[PDB]
């Protein structure tokens, strides 16, 4: 929603729109495994004026590559004015969540299993038992290839995104079907109306 | 072009035979430079260098060198110099008046008013600029020299003299353009075939130039393309490269650049380089059993000549690049056939600690090509996976989702545009 509306012809800047691009930063960095770069056909003065207004935010984007608690703490204290400006309590540990996103995602394609005590040592993780705790909520996140070995302390990856083998696959694709269907439907409808253009 | 550079020092030189090898400006240049990160062997390097300032006498560099001399001498005096500086100043005035001698000569020869007289004027002008170690206006003559060359031998003259300049001029872009020229541009096949399969290949000098280019230019592909092209029958240039450095330099630019097949062709079926081949038995069997993969002692002498490539002025500036891609391609070499990377004996080979081993590997993870994972308790990888079809599936769906995303985006974009929509400035 943000990006599709922010390429709109923009010449008036708003701290409202500042909260907009800030929260967009929040998602696009936290929500992603790394940074997004956008279709840069947004405002002339606005998109390029708030862009230095996004000084701390580009640097914090770099921070997404950094993995340092103290600096992000300091910047959070800086922007706490925005952190709670609309009862948006929790944005900082949203950032921390993106942090452990990076942690776990790195860990993802590394290996099959480690000394997960030693891995918690590895990944700046705050608690080995705790480590499996958020691992297992990733299991509530339903994504992880991990597993619960109290005895051997073993967490493996299991590499089953899909085995291309489903009526479920059929459902994914039928979704694709009807979606693209109506997509092309309004393509043809809007084309149709382009036919309605006057003497030209 | 000095990199700070730490030590730092390697005792693995013999400078007497280096000055036997190299000469001129570059001689004392590397003398200085090596001495810098080679203290106390700094000593004799700089001693013989300054005596080379007693050789055609650039005594400005004498000033610099005895400056360093007394500096490190007093610094020495913790441990435990005496020099004929005044007579040096006398001979200095001698040199300067000889400068004036040849200047008067120069202007005489200006007055001669002969295009070939003009050309030899350029020649000898740059000559004495070389002589007393101050070089500037020399270039002008050679900067002027091209305006006096028309014929094929005139092309020969312009090219070889501009680049013989560049021996200590040492400037790529224009002079590399003229390497390209003098090999190709004038009188295609050069009207001389570069000496018709050039007996003494100044092509070799062209090669050295472009090789240092893609040293700095770092496009080492054509670098090694020329490095293989070593043609012994040029047979002489003390400023060209020491055949030790010649072969090591070239072949290791290659050993960075290559893919194994044509390079073994370049190496095992190297013929033109075979003398250059047979120069360093060290680096020869180094790369031999490297491709044969005795990684342990290969890497051993690798980072043993660490210090001596450092001892190269020109191997120093890319030691990290080299050793980087070296151990990279060491990986690339052995790892490719396997399916599950066991480490134990293999680590016994590479001589990296189990953690350091696997963190090398972790690095590898950062870029690596195999869909591979490790039971650390295996102390062993399993390498890349199997399917690419389903991979295509997932990329397909990612495709489609962002497609529909863009599609709605552009629907709404048609709205915002055709709904007049924008943002005013205030």
UniProtKB/Swiss-Prot annotation, chain A:
Similarity comment text for this entry: Belongs to the CSN3 family.
Additional detail: Amplified and overexpressed in some osteosarcomas (OS), suggesting that it may participate in TP53 degradation in OS.
Protein name: COP9 signalosome complex subunit 3
Gene: COPS3
Domain PCI: 1-162
Subcellular location as annotated: Cytoplasm; Nucleus
Tissues in which the UniProt entry reports expression: Widely expressed. Expressed at high level in heart and skeletal muscle.
Function of the protein: Component of the COP9 signalosome complex (CSN), a complex involved in various cellular and developmental processes. The CSN complex is an essential regulator of the ubiquitin (Ubl) conjugation pathway by mediating the deneddylation of the cullin subunits of SCF-type E3 ligase complexes, leading to decrease the Ubl ligase activity of SCF-type complexes such as SCF, CSA or DDB2. The complex is also involved in phosphorylation of p53/TP53, c-jun/JUN, IkappaBalpha/NFKBIA, ITPK1 and IRF8/ICSBP, possibly via its association with CK2 and PKD kinases.
Subunit description: Component of the CSN complex, composed of COPS1/GPS1, COPS2, COPS3, COPS4, COPS5, COPS6, COPS7 (COPS7A or COPS7B), COPS8 and COPS9 isoform 1. In the complex, it probably interacts directly with COPS1, COPS4, COPS8 and COPS9 isoform 1. Interacts with CK2 and PKD. Interacts with the translation initiation factor EIF3S6 and IKBKG. Interacts with ERCC6.
Lineage of origin: Eukaryota, Metazoa, Chordata, Craniata, Vertebrata
Domain of life: Eukaryota
Curated annotation (Swiss-Prot), chain B:
Annotated Pfam families: CSN1_C, PCI, RPN7
Domain notes: The PCI domain is necessary and sufficient for the interactions with other CSN subunits of the complex. Mediates the interaction with CAPN8.
SUPFAM superfamilies attached to this UniProt entry: Winged helix' DNA-binding domain
Record localization: Cytoplasm; Nucleus
Gene3D superfamilies: 1.25.40.570
Bilayer-spanning residue ranges: none
InterPro entries: CSN1_C, PCI_dom, Rpn7/CSN1, Rpn7_N, WH_DNA-bd_sf
Family in the record: Belongs to the CSN1 family.
PROSITE patterns: PCI (PS50250)
GO CC terms: COP9 signalosome; cytoplasm; cytosol; nucleoplasm; nucleus
Purpose: Essential component of the COP9 signalosome complex (CSN), a complex involved in various cellular and developmental processes. The CSN complex is an essential regulator of the ubiquitin (Ubl) conjugation pathway by mediating the deneddylation of the cullin subunits of SCF-type E3 ligase complexes, leading to decrease the Ubl ligase activity of SCF-type complexes such as SCF, CSA or DDB2. The complex is also involved in phosphorylation of p53/TP53, c-jun/JUN, IkappaBalpha/NFKBIA, ITPK1 and IRF8/ICSBP, possibly via its association with CK2 and PKD kinases.
Stated name of the protein: COP9 signalosome complex subunit 1
Native species: Homo sapiens
Distribution of this protein across tissues and organs: Widely expressed.
Subunit structure: Component of the CSN complex, composed of COPS1/GPS1, COPS2, COPS3, COPS4, COPS5, COPS6, COPS7 (COPS7A or COPS7B), COPS8 and COPS9 isoform 1. In the complex, it probably interacts directly with COPS2, COPS3, COPS4 and COPS5. Interacts directly with inositol kinase ITPK1. Interacts with CAPN8. Interacts with USP48. Interacts with ASB4; this interaction negatively regulates GPS1.
Primary residence: cytoplasm
Record keywords: Cytoplasm, Nucleus, Phosphoprotein, Signalosome
GO biological process: JNK cascade; protein deneddylation; protein neddylation; regulation of protein neddylation
PANTHER family linked to this entry: 26S PROTESOME SUBUNIT 6, COP9 SIGNALOSOME COMPLEX SUBUNIT 1
Residue stretches making up the PCI domain: 226-388
Residue list for modification Phosphoserine: 425
GO MF assignments: GTPase inhibitor activity
